[PDB]
Amino acid sequence: SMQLNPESADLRALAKHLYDSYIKSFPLTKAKARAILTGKTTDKSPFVIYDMNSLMMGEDPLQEQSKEVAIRIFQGCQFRSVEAVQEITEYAKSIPGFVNLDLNDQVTLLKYGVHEIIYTMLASLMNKDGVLISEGQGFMTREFLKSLRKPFGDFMEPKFEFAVKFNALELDDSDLAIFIAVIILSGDRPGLLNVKPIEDIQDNLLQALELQLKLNHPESSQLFAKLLQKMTDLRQIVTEHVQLLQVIKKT
Amino acid sequence: SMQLNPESADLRALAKHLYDSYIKSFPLTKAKARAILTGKTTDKSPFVIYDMNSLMMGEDKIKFKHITPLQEQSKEVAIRIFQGCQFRSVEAVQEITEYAKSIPGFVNLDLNDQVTLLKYGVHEIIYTMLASLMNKDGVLISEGQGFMTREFLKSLRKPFGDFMEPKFEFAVKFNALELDDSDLAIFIAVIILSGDRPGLLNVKPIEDIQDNLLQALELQLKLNHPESSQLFAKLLQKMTDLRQIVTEHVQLLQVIKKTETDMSLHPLLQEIYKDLY
Ligand SMILES: Cc1cccc(Nc2cc(Cl)nc(SCC(=O)O)n2)c1C
Ligand SMILES: Cc1cccc(Nc2cc(Cl)nc(SCC(=O)O)n2)c1C
């Protein structure tokens, strides 16, 4: 049980702040994405890329223009990944305390954070069938991405695997805003000078998260613990990504 | 706020069960170790290894239990000490396996899954419990009979000098949570019953057991640490640290593996050198 007091009020105020910021930083929210994936909004009718024929109809710089469909698609992911770092960096700047940190720690926390957030928010854009691309204008199937020649055909599978289990938590934009902020303010990132001040902020964010998950998910056993376990999955996934980016890099 | 009801009583019964199993499987508890490290018990007065002189007096006055067989008997102090760690690691697996067998549900699982969970879990439990034996200054060895300093371990020739540092780094942050044996019994049982281990067939039944254990843990941490912010969350975050720590251990065991005949032939070569030149 809880009480409505000044402490619980400030954690609600903190949660509202992060959501309004999330909304300003992230154009394609989970609510928007779920609406497109379930046919509800007329606004977007994404083109479905499910095979080589629809990939060609689908597209419709100069010296990285490759014949190999696998190359063009991996360059799409790379461009959107740079865009996603901008959005996350904008979000990060609205987390109370975060700019009052050593400019050094700031770039550190972001350096290891972005890949964890990308994967977290990639789940928002995914169902069983595939993933929204180009702000909900395109939809690329899981199986088409699997069909790409090795090792590109193995690139997104682990992301799909993550998303199925993560989307079963049934988190909304309010849940995700606080979760994403908890990820960024991670004490245990290599090379940080001032750890305590990052930790004191995360303790507040973890409190805000616990309060948000209790209020927002009345029918949910250990959703806080199941969410914090996911931060372990995400580390493992980044490791597997990096190892694959460095097999692709080599050949 | 909570209620004392049948559900909360089953969770306290489950915690009591795990503690009494932990006391049975783990001869040197944190409570015993803290008592040695603070000088309270006269029972153990550990011999302190802090330099090559005390290491030599150390092997003869500690009866390590771990008798290194005749033909892996190295001159290189670094070799003998790593072989010490290796023998105590095998011993630690026996103790964890025994503990594992008492976690309700754990034996009702595919014998395959049982071996999987233990296969990845022992490395995480070893680090967890090594913290129990550590302070700022070093680590208890041979069931509290010795104490080897952090700095003496760092002083050993590369790469052996880098072997325990990460364990000290982890222990410092983990020991600041101030967990006791009750807390650790449930935390260790949570780690073993991890759904996400490569190669498990039946995930759900492991997940169902772990959800009960995470409930028992939350209740134990609330009742046992009244003055502690988000201790449950901070404990779960440690379970992420341990993955990264094990990855670093394993990579170092495989740099040692590659160069193991090469490093214990430096002494006999050092003799041939000063004999010739
Ligand atoms: C153009 C294109 C082709 C194939 C896949 C994807 N999606 C990706 C891939 C990666 Cl690695 N990262 C992202 S960022 C997801 C988001 O936060 O919107 N989006 C995109 C956007
Ligand atoms: C000879 C020596 C030197 C340094 C450390 C240790 N002890 C270790 C080493 C390792 Cl890798 N693992 C353990 S398990 C800790 C426990 O519960 O006793 N104990 C030992 C036995």
Curated annotation (Swiss-Prot), chain A:
Q: Name one GO molecular function term.
A: double-stranded DNA binding
Give yes or no: UniProt keyword Nucleus: yes
Q: Please indicate if the UniProt record lists ATP-binding as a keyword.
A: no
- Chief subcellular location equals nucleus
Induction info reads: (Microbial infection) Expression increases when incubated with M.tuberculosis or its lipoprotein LpqH; induction is TLR2-dependent (at protein level).
List residues binding rosiglitazone: Q78, F79, R80, S81, H115, H241
Q: Which UniProt keywords apply?
A: Activator, Biological rhythms, Cytoplasm, Diabetes mellitus, Disease variant, DNA-binding, Glycoprotein, Isopeptide bond, Metal-binding, Nucleus, Obesity, Phosphoprotein, Receptor, Transcription, Transcription regulation, Ubl conjugation, Zinc, Zinc-finger
Q: Which GO terms describe its biological process?
A: BMP signaling pathway; cell differentiation; cell fate commitment; cell maturation; cellular response to hypoxia; cellular response to insulin stimulus; cellular response to low-density lipoprotein particle stimulus; epithelial cell differentiation
Please give the annotated consequence of changing R80H: In colon cancer; sporadic; somatic mutation; partial loss of ligand-binding
Q: How is it modified after translation?
A: Phosphorylated in basal conditions and dephosphorylated when treated with the ligand. May be dephosphorylated by PPP5C.
GO CC annotation terms, alphabetical: chromatin; cytosol; intracellular membrane-bounded organelle; nucleoplasm; nucleus; receptor complex; RNA polymerase II transcription regulator complex
Q: Which domain of life is it from?
A: Eukaryota
Variant or mutagenesis effect after changing Q78P: In colon cancer; sporadic; somatic mutation; loss of ligand-binding
Summarizing the function annotation, the protein's role is: Nuclear receptor that binds peroxisome proliferators such as hypolipidemic drugs and fatty acids. Once activated by a ligand, the nuclear receptor binds to DNA specific PPAR response elements (PPRE) and modulates the transcription of its target genes, such as acyl-CoA oxidase. It therefore controls the peroxisomal beta-oxidation pathway of fatty acids. Key regulator of adipocyte differentiation and glucose homeostasis. ARF6 acts as a key regulator of the tissue-specific adipocyte P2 (aP2) enhancer.
Subunit details for this protein?
Interacts with FOXO1 (acetylated form). Heterodimer with other nuclear receptors, such as RXRA. The heterodimer with the retinoic acid receptor RXRA is called adipocyte-specific transcription factor ARF6. Interacts with NCOA6 coactivator, leading to a strong increase in transcription of target genes. Interacts with coactivator PPARBP, leading to a mild increase in transcription of target genes. Interacts with NOCA7 in a ligand-inducible manner. Interacts with NCOA1 and NCOA2 LXXLL motifs. Interacts with ASXL1, ASXL2, DNTTIP2, FAM120B, MAP2K1/MEK1, NR0B2, PDPK1, PRDM16, PRMT2 and TGFB1I1.
Family membership noted in the UniProt record: Belongs to the nuclear hormone receptor family. NR1 subfamily.
Clinical disorder: Defects in PPARG can lead to type 2 insulin-resistant diabetes and hyptertension. PPARG mutations may be associated with colon cancer. Obesity: A condition characterized by an increase of body weight beyond the limitation of skeletal and physical requirements, as the result of excessive accumulation of body fat.
Q: What is this protein called?
A: Peroxisome proliferator-activated receptor gamma
Organism from which the protein derives: Homo sapiens (Human)
Whole sequence portion shown: 231 to 487 of 505
